[PDB]
């Protein structure tokens, strides 16, 4: 399935200056923001599809994750494979590990109150993480295997959604400023 979603949100804070690139290609050039997400990839996420890009610009200046990104309702629940970051490793409840695509990722559980969500400026829901061990090397084709994540995240307890909303690879940002180039299939 060839990328069909082009996410592309900020909060207003500074630039985020962002391209729709052709095909599954964007690119991102940022300076001092607020909060944004910007990525390509699907108008329904899927828990068994592989996601697969190729990150030839990562050059985050404070805070930025290479990650996927999506969500769920019913329950609303917002969920990450983060692959690389910039300044900040993002943590939270730890729940165990799982291993994939040849790398480690951490799993964790946070909550987010009165925040912007798919369902509104102001609204409070849970987030699930699979934060790898360490920065993914960035420059070549990798996979996103999300079974695995969203087995393991099963296997503790924490099950997404039943209504698939958007599933990126994304670039988030705070607090920061950057560079990306990232294509997506
Ligand atoms: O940042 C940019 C990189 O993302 C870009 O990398 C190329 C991304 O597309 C890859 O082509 C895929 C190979 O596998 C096939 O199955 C897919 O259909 C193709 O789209 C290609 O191999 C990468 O080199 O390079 C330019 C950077 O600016
Ligand atoms: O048109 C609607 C959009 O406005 C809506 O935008 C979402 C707003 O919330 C964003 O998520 C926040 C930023 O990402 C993480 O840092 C935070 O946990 C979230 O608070 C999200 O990226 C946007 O898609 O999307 C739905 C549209 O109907
Ligand atoms: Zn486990």
Redesign the pocket.
Known sequence: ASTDYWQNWTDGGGIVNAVNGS???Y?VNWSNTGNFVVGKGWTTGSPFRTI??????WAPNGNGYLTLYGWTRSPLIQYYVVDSWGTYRPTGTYKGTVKSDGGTYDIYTTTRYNAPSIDGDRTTFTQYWSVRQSKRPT?S?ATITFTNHVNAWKSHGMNLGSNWAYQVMATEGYQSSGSS???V?
């Open positions: 095909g599954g290609n690119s697969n890009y190729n990150a030839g610009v420059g084709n180039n990232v294509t299939w």
